[PDB]
Amino acid sequence: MLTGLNHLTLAVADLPASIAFYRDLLGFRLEARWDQGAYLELGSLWLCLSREPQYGGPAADYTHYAFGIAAADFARFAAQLRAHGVREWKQNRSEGDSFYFLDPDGHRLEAHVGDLRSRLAACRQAPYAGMRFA
Amino acid sequence: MLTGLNHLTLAVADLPASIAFYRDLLGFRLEARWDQGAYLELGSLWLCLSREPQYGGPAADYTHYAFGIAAADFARFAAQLRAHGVREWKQNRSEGDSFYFLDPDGHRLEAHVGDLRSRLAACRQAPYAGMRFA
Numbered sequence A, B: 001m002l003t004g005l006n007h008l009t010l011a012v013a014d015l016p017a018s019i020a021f022y023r024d025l026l027g028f029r030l031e032a033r034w035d036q037g038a039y040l041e042l043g044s045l046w047l048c049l050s051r052e053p054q055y056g057g058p059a060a061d062y063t064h065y066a067f068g069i070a071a072a073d074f075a076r077f078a079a080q081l082r083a084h085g086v087r088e089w090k091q092n093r094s095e096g097d098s099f100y101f102l103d104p105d106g107h108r109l110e111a112h113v114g115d116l117r118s119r120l121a122a123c124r125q126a127p128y129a130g131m132r133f134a
């Protein structure tokens, strides 16, 4: 029996580049670094970057990782990353503010205002095609 | 500005199949289902499944998603998944018991005993190549 997410691990071709992005641009804390990886923390999230040199990034699909942000900080976050030249991969069409951006290898990230409970609430009013609740 | 992990989204080719895997085999609670996806919950983890009928699973790299498990439940979980025919993608060699298995699309998963604190404790006494804390 599982208790939740324990850690998220991303393959990275350029370790120094990825540490810089997550620590300096996104605000993660660098807890450890070694020749082949790094461990960072953000709130309770344990992130690990695992160096893998010929890594060519993910394939083109919907898999992505969303981080929380308070409503009051959204606009400034989005403005800051855009000013830094981060590339976006999706435009927001779903409940709560969301900014959809890529990391150095092309891993798909998201900064989202909202949670499961708020998404479910909005859904109960405006169902996606064929929605069942339970 | 960011606060933590808000949600994990995985692309899935066969929605019925992935739902059955996460709910029954891993014990996630199914909160909602629609023609193109599902929302499941485990502890504070919000898992989203996004249907992509032609999706062929990720490429081969170290990107993976680990879920927490208590030391006393570990053997049983591993034993159970092995009996159900789940395929493994790695053998444990780092601090804390870990079982590394694939989902139906080939996303790489992990059930892990321990956390960042426990890992940092072990690393100090035995550092990886060129490790540094801070």
Ligand SMILES: [Mn+2]
Pocket: A064, A066, A110, B007, B009
């Ligand atoms: Mn999302």
Ligand SMILES: [Mn+2]
Pocket: A007, A009, B064, B066, B110
């Ligand atoms: Mn791991």
Ligand SMILES: [Tl+]
Pocket: A044, B044
């Ligand atoms: Tl948490």
Ligand SMILES: [Tl+]
Pocket: A007, A009, A048
């Ligand atoms: Tl780890």
Ligand SMILES: [Tl+]
Pocket: A092, A093, A094, A095, A096, A097, A098, A112
């Ligand atoms: Tl959204």
Ligand SMILES: [Tl+]
Pocket: B007, B048
């Ligand atoms: Tl979502």
Ligand SMILES: [Tl+]
Pocket: A062, B050
């Ligand atoms: Tl999608």
Ligand SMILES: [Tl+]
Pocket: B092, B093, B094, B095, B096, B097, B098, B112
């Ligand atoms: Tl381990």
